Amino acid sequence: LPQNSAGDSFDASAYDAYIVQAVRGTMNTMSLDDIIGMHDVKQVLHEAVTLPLLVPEFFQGLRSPWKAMVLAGPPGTGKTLIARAIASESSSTFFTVSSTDLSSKWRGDSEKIVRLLFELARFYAPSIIFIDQIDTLGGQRGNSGEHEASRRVKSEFLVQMDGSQNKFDSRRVFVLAATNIPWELDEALRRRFEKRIFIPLPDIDARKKLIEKSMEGTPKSDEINYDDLAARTEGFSGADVVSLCRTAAINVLRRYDTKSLRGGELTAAMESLKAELVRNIDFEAALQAVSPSAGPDTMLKCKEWCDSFGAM
Amino acid sequence: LPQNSAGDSFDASAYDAYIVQAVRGTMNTMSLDDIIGMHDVKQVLHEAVTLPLLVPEFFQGLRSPWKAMVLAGPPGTGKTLIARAIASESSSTFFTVSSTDLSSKWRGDSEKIVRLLFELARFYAPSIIFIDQIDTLGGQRGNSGEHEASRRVKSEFLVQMDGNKFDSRRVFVLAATNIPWELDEALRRRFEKRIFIPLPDIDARKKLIEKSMEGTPKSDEINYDDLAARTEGFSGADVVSLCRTAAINVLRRYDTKSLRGGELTAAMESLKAELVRNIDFEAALQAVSPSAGPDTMLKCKEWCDSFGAM
Amino acid sequence: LPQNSAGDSFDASAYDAYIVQAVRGTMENTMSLDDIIGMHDVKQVLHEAVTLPLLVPEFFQGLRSPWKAMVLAGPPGTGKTLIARAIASESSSTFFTVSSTDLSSKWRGDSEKIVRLLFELARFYAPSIIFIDQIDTLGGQRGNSGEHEASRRVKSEFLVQMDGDSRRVFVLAATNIPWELDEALRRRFEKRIFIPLPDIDARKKLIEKSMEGTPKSDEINYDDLAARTEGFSGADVVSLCRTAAINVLRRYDTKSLRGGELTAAMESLKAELVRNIDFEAALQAVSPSAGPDTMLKCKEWCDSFGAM
Amino acid sequence: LPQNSAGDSFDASAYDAYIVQAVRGTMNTMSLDDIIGMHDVKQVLHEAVTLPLLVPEFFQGLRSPWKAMVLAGPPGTGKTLIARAIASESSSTFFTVSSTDLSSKWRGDSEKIVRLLFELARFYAPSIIFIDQIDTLGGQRGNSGEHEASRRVKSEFLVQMDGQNKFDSRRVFVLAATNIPWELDEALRRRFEKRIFIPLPDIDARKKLIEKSMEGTPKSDEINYDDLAARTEGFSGADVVSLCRTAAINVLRRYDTKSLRGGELTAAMESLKAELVRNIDFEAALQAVSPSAGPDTMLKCKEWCDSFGAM
Amino acid sequence: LPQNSAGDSFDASAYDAYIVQAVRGTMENTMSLDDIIGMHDVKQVLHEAVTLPLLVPEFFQGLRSPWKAMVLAGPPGTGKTLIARAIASESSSTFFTVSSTDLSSKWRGDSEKIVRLLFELARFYAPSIIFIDQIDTLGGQRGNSGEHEASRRVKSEFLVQMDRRVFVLAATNIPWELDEALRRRFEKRIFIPLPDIDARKKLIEKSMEGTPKSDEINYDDLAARTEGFSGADVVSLCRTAAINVLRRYDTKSLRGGELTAAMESLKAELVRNIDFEAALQAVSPSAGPDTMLKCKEWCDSFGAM
Amino acid sequence: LPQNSAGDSFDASAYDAYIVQAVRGTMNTMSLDDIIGMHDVKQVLHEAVTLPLLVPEFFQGLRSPWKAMVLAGPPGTGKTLIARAIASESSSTFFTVSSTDLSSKWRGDSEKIVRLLFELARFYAPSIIFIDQIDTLGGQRGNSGEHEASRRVKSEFLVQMDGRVFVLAATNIPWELDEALRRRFEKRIFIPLPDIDARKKLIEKSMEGTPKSDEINYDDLAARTEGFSGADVVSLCRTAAINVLRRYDTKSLRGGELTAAMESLKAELVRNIDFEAALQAVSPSAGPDTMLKCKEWCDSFGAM
């Protein structure tokens, strides 16, 4: 384990070797204008991560900074992306915790990993933790057929996420989480996650700006009407418009005969290909060849849940 | 290990170093008058902690003081706050154990950390043990998916918590939970006070909104009766969260995403004097919803009205 | 290790120095066998297995050799750790006490030697008595799932040690989950007895035995408080008496006086009677830790397998 | 864990000695022109494996190579054959994963095998992972009878497959194969780009398969391949090879060759080397094996891949 | 250690003194083999395996060599250890007793030393009988899930060490958990059944040989009403009958005085047939008929009866 | 090691000098046609070892030459007899592999022995090796409390199975086999109970030294021993022989003049009542449940 700023150290004698290794093993060039839409999530991150680093004299008392946020939405949009975006464009240490680190063969080695994780995140810095796929980790607490060791992991998160009983020695921490199934969190753990926020599928203008964003760096023609592509991809998620642009960019390879020249005269035709632009024929065939991973019953259920018990 | 009052010393020789360390590792200035409501819990804590220090010539015969108490109710209502307020107002040695101090991968340490804990709690002082989330620790005994090394911990809690007419050193075991129908039938008997804790009614949210808004400059336009009547089913934590989101909504009217570095602290001086208006409550009351619908409140009330001893 | 009667000595040489400290850690005249009400059958078995061999030991020979074990089993609050204290107070015998935690060590093969030292010390000292509390731990069938390897040698040491020299040990166990016992261990417990919740006439004697010693009124009708409980576990009637007795402190409110003239108000409240309003206001705040299906399961098991 | 290219070695310190052996247990002359039909699969495999190997200056940025493919359809069509063919076609390292490798006794000893498998696939060369029968590993997540140790395997796949992504170190390509493409997840479908569907019968493909299976030196008289194509309706790609096999067993089963020894034993064995088959053993071979597949599964998979499938 | 016959001496110099103490601590209050009711086949094998080679050592020379192992299976309470103690008493063979608390061995590489020293000491005193009680323990599967790295050495030390005359008995309640390589080293797997209608009357008539019964000669009824009594429960029935002879005179009221002449008034009191009827209402069998059926099926499948 | 055909020689100086001495100690006129059952096994061996070595252009290409077979059945059938008959009938270097030819004390030499064995099998001739008692060699690979060297020797076992040399398996407990082992086992054939053929001669050989009457008919007894294993006939004659002793009275009367009664009992000879009481008292230790589970396994995981 390295030292922190201001030259102190950490006395990790009470925990074994492999637990320290398994918490140490979870420790650029992105920016928060590379995320199309999602205004209120950017607002909450701006007033709970970036503003206390600048003006710490304001957030004292009732205006204390937040310490949790869970993003709930359909499986297409940008939730994993906003965590790496806030990890790059900040000055705090980043803990990526998945559900496969809080797991060991012995008895009583998950809760000690969670305890060491929160102690390290409080010791180092004003850090933030990003628990990805929270619903495989904390489910309901009184279900039929859960193990007797996952219950202690949920109880450890419950005891550790609120605390720091001394009003002095206030070192900040911030827990971020993403879910596709938000109606399956415990009623006691859902209280600690203040600021439940829904993330919607992109609208018309978000689809237009995302097509404009991803189609730069590659030369296109001037006959592409972006309004027709923005109005014809009705029902597309956020991670399907990028797949549409990738299919439209490789269709300029599919229209030439490259399977025929098998090795011979193959390196020669690739020379003139890298500057050939993409006309409207490729976007027409890419619309004809790509369908969304639809079924908006999950989007409807998640929107009704975050409209009932949500706090933007 | 430290000494105690009257200069004695404990002789911890038969226990290894990492057990007495794990028990040593579990040993601001708020008053009991800021907890809103919960009158009967204050009454039992009063006549079980405060009065045996002032006049001990009364609690002698049949009136020996209570030895346990379990709070039960929906999440976010005021349990760990009453535990920290008792730790801050009394003069007792306070232990805060949980389900992760009592576990170790060796065989025969889970049922020795508990024994060392109770021996220190009876040796030191008129102490108070606060076992948190006891539904994790003591479950139903003759169950299906129970590993063998939890039966010994439940048996140790059953053996320690009931024992000569001498040894008049007091130990008061306070415990909190929010799924009370999973406690063992041999352990539900030991906790001889099983009080229920309700969500606040329409007169205990007015005092809570008045209490959390002392310090921030507000106007004289807001009327607390309408804000007490438009919140139904809110917990204590949700009312505190609403009173926080109002002041952050005072921040959210100015576009502070625009200024970058230059005199931003000078720009933040005009903001640290603005008053919290009614528009901020009309926005924050639409921005905040309760955390859970009523289905565990009704089950906890149906349990504590048939098996509870208030 | 102290010497026994008649000045003998034990040779604890083959054992380590922390096993003997644990067994010595397991090892008066205050209570009596009249303080417990009800339970005539277990009192008869104790009287014929503990007391009467001491007076006329020329009678208990041959077929009438005295009993060697017992199991008290029933609902979780009816009084079965009280009778172990009442037989420890009212006897002249070495009374061990072994819970489930004075057997475990994290070293391999010291958990099944504490048992052997316990039985050898119990033989060597006296006509002694062992009281293994919560016998459903260290019980269970031996062909179970998730059973550790040391926790079978514990059961095998209990199995090989508890049979087969006119020296007497009387192992007495108590539990509230009786059906989770071994098949070759509940053969050795030669008397398996049931204890019920108290009936209508036992609860009146329990009320009168707990309430005496505290000055009361002469208008309390005890028969109504005996007929009005109807399901109280026998350890909850003491709780009803205590909540009735402490209710004289919640009638004169002391939460308003803090220090100022309080200690004389606690003298004016020292000798105040317990009127009927106390019991009427205490019956609406005490309920049992009920669920009588545990009592019905224990009744069915002790009526299909009990040997009184 | 022997070695890789350029002589480096792996540091398997954090994993046990019975897991790394179970990942090591997951590691011939089949041509690329043996498979007939299936032009979409060959196109995607070509432009995602072979052209990125030769000229990687073309594939960067927006034209990044693909990372996934699903082969869904009726049983007996040749998905394992395409897996083995693209194994033998390149010099890639070939892993093979079924549902019987990812199962152990101790809690948390199954989530490590997936992580070690993906770590070895990244540590070695450009490699191909072939998850066979993914309808059992990744089902629906919020199901009714979901086990508590099968949600963390799906969570491990979801977290491992999308990855702190720039300057791509080493390419991995993960296939799949299923018969039931609707009992699959909603966060594992999205990570599987290029979901495609393959059909079993075609009349020119049936003709080419009976052309590519006929290697009998006798029977220059039973060439009824037009009638063998008209009687190939409802037959899968596996039924045709077994049809040719039962034809070649009915070549020697039309004539009784039992109790033929002592007198002309050797002459009875080499006279079947030129035993001319006709329409009679051809018809007996037709009436031997029936098409044991109904149209409901193929119609359901076609109705699924017409709506949720990106070619 | 003592010496052996013919004046020789054993040189146990390569072992520590405490291993010699732990093996020496295991090695005649007269019983008789006629004091056990039932089980003629087990006595038949014990006869042919222990008693005949003492008297006719010329007949057992080659292929008619005696048996060298045995393992008794059955329900709890059917009398497995009584056969072992009875054959321990009335024989000039050196007896032993091995249990699972006797191979404790807190150090490493020391349990196999105890086992090997036991089997070296058995082939020193030339007739020898070993009685490994409760062989369920130490007899798990050699490739099981939760097992130490030392218990497999114990099972391997037996499987190499089972091959100067010795004889090894055993006894089990759950015989299906025996290992496959440990099973075929035992030459005879006998079943031990519950008492029938004829054996129970003999047991009630044998146990009440000291106290005076008077006219309750209706022993067929007592052999009829106890349906599934497990052999070790009818002894509890006779014991409860004698203590119920004590219980009819109310003795819990006297306090010291007249507690000798009244105890002399009961020393000659005879057992009427009200007490057996009052004793059948308060004795029930210790288990159900489950383990009987399971061991019966295991002996039908594997038991070389 | 001796020389092989076509003028070749092995130089095994890279390996140890004691592993070769442990593999060289494994290198007649037995029953050629005395097995009157399972003629399909005779046909598949006839087309797998005899026919691709007489006419090697008849079993090629589409007529695929096999590589492995797993024999499964009762312990009373001829599992060793068929492999020994093809060993004494063919002209190939028959090797054998039990669980005893693979165990060594050092680490790193328990896996080289199978490499040397397959190298000698490919080097000498188009041989045939037979893994005897495969039921203990390869079980589950991903097991827990087993030591790691079994996984290493099984990985070295899988490293050299692809390579002519005809490996063949015989198992009695096939359900312990791994899911990855059974891929190379190309036919898990269901082998049934045998006929009278070789049990009668074992009855005749196992009663020598004991006087017998001339009224015992071995056909009726050898037609009633349907399913007995190798040692079960020995158990039958042991039950008859000790029934001769137990028919007399020596348990009741004791001590006095037992020598004459024992000598008169030793003079006694086996009658038909002894064997008739022995066939009802020597019940087979092979219970009638294992063949059923072998039937369900060969229906599930094999093609039989």
Added chain:
Amino acid sequence: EEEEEEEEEEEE
């Protein structure tokens, strides 16, 4: 002089 300890594993 190599002592031995006992540990606890959990399974599913």
